[PDB]
Amino acid sequence: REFTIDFSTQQSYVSSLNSIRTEISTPLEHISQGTTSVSVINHTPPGSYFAVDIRGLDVARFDHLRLIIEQNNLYVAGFVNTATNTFYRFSDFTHISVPGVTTVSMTTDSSYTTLQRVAALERSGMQISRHSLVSSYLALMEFSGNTMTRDASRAVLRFVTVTAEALRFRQIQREFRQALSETAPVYTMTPGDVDLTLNWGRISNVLPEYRGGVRVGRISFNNISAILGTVAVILNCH
Numbered sequence: 337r338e339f340t341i342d343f344s345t346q347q348s349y350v351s352s353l354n355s356i357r358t359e360i361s362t363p364l365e366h367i368s369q370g371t372t373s374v375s376v377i378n379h380t381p382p383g384s385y386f387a388v389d390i391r392g393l394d395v396a397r398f399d400h401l402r403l404i405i406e407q408n409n410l411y412v413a414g415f416v417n418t419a420t421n422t423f424y425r426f427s428d429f430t431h432i433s434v435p436g437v438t439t440v441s442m443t444t445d446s447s448y449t450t451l452q453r454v455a456a457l458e459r460s461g462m463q464i465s466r467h468s469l470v471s472s473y474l475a476l477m478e479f480s481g482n483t484m485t486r487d488a489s490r491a492v493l494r495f496v497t498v499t500a501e502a503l504r505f506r507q508i509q510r511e512f513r514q515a516l517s518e519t520a521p522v523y524t525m526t527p528g529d530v531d532l533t534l535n536w537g538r539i540s541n542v543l544p545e546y547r548g549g550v551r552v553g554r555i556s557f558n559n560i561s562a563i564l565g566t567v568a569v570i571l572n573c574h
């Protein structure tokens with residue numbers, strides 16, 4: 337199953353993320369206002385994945401990058417060069433099998449720990465713009481081989497943040513989407529954004545029990561609107 341994340345405009349980015357969320361998850365009854373909710377990922381068999389086609393980096397070019405995402409946990413299993421028809425797969429996702437593509441089993445694992453080392457780039461303070469997403473796209477299209485390089489690791493860190501982490505966290509969707517406007521400002525990932533991503537599992541475990549503020553580690557939600565403003569999609573663990 338294939339979805340597009342369209343970076344053409346702020347509105348195309350948000351609506352394409354919402355379209356994915358509606359297809360893979362179901363809103364929580366107690367955390368909904370209007371058309372906006374926290375949603376729980378629908379259960380799928382182990383190894384289920386979907387594809388994300390990256391589009392609209394230039395407001396029709398730069399259109400050969402595809403991400404493979406494990407559906408139950410939204411981790412990025414690797415990336416596909418659709419021009420060469422090659423799937424570069426992280427070493428901890430050998431259970432994800434994409435037919436019809438040449439699969440390269442990389443020596444590098446998907447963890448942020450590993451990727452930040454190879455990238456020599458910490459996520460706290462990492463900057464993302466339309467320009468650096470284009471640069472990241474070109475790095476991934478040029479990448480070949482079995483071991484991730486510095487430029488490809490930086491590319492993955494940027495793209496994972498604006499796809500998988502934005503799908504999870506409305507806060508990250510909202511702070512990055514500004515970068516797609518014609519003014520083209522730069523998104524800076526904050527320590528708070530990083531804290532969110534590090535707490536996704538427990539947040540996913542706490543929110544289904546929430547009724548009518550709540551706190552998980554360093555993340556504090558004072559009311560429903562703060563929850564909705566921050567979290568979009570949670571794991572199915574309860």
Ligand SMILES: O=C(O)c1ccc(-c2ccc(Cl)cc2)o1
Nearest residue numbers: 409536537538539540541571573
């Ligand atoms: O894939 C993950 O990261 C994952 C799956 C389940 C959890 C988790 C972590 C902490 C709590 Cl308290 C509850 C669930 O995390």
Ligand SMILES: O=C(O)c1ccc(-c2ccc(Cl)cc2)o1
Nearest residue numbers: 350372506509510561562564565
């Ligand atoms: O892309 C965004 O910025 C976005 C889409 C929906 C929301 C939102 C914010 C707060 C509440 Cl209470 C409910 C929904 O924000």
Ligand SMILES: [Cl-]
Nearest residue numbers: 371372373374
């Ligand atoms: Cl929603």
Ligand SMILES: [Cl-]
Nearest residue numbers: 397398399400
């Ligand atoms: Cl191209």
Ligand SMILES: [Cl-]
Nearest residue numbers: 447448449450
């Ligand atoms: Cl690890």
Ligand SMILES: [Cl-]
Nearest residue numbers: 458459460530
């Ligand atoms: Cl960091």
Ligand SMILES: [Cl-]
Nearest residue numbers: 346517518519
């Ligand atoms: Cl604007």
